[PDB]
Design a protein around this ligand. Structure first.
Ligand SMILES: Nc1ncnc2c1ncn2[C@@H]1O[C@H](CSCC[C@H](N)C(=O)O)[C@@H](O)[C@H]1O
Length: 232
């Protein structure tokens, strides 16, 4: 999707809970169960596509270090206002205005202060599917060498119908679904462009960049692209 899409507020509709059908609520619950299931191996959660910080509350509750990464300034400002409000220290909870494309520049080893194995680059609610160039994101991920959890969707007709039911409740000028060699693409002329990549297309792309990924299916319509020792 476009930066303008989110900047101008159209993108806000995608985290309005009133717009979540049952299959997507189930998806978000399943997303959290996978995160919980490796929680004991996470000291630093890096939320990639964080918005205002959807999993900040998770990190606060579980006593984890937090970095929200999002290229939308108004979302970074919202997240930072939340940290100031509760008086949370910067050395534990931060926001970084940037793209997943430059993750390797945003997260140099020294800046972590946590072993690589206890870090998780968590891309929630199909943030990865809304990124301009997935090939750039995968290379950036490769160069960080950090464990990651890319939460996205399956490309079964049922998964596509779940996404259609979710996106259509945002009431954009029009909504197009297309299936091609890469995956299932939803577009709207507001600047919405959301992909779910076929398991058969993306797994080879992952391995090409040396990422030892497993596509873990969850909550009927989800697949979690999981790499790192906590997924042994
Ligand atoms: N290159 C990028 N790097 C990091 N975050 C990005 C990004 N491109 C978009 N995002 C952010 O990802 C967040 C969620 S987009 C997710 C859309 C929707 N939940 C879906 O199911 O497809 C937004 O805040 C957006 O600004």
């Amino acid at each position: 999707s476009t930066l303008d899409f989110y900047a101008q507020g159209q993108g806000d509709r995608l985290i309005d809970p009133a717009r979540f059908p049952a299959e997507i609520k189930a998806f978000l619950e399943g997303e959290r169960v996978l995160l919980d299931s490796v929680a004991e191996h996470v000291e630093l959660l890096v939320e990639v596509g964080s918005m205002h910080g959807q999993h900040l509350g998770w990190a606060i509750a579980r006593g984890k270090h937090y970095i929200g990464v999002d290229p939308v300034p108004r979302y970074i400002e919202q997240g930072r206002r939340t940290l100031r409000e509760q008086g949370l220290p910067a050395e534990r909870f931060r926001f970084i205005e940037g793209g997943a494309e430059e993750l390797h520049q945003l997260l140099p080893r020294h800046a972590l202060a946590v072993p690589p194995s206890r870090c998780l680059l968590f891309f929630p609610f199909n943030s990865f599917g809304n990124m301009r160039d997935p090939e750039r994101v995968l290379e950036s991920l490769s160069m960080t060498g950090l464990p990651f959890l890319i939460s996205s969707y399956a490309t079964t007709e049922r998964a596509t119908q779940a996404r259609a039911a979710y996106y259509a409740q945002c009431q954009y000028e029009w909504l197009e679904s297309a299936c091609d060699e890469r995956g299932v693409r939803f577009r709207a002329p507001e600047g919405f462009d959301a992909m779910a990549y076929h398991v058969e297309y993306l797994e080879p792309r992952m391995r090409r960049y040396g990422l030892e990924v497993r596509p873990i299916p969850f909550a009927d319509v989800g697949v979690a692209w999981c790499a790192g020792p906590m997924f042994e």
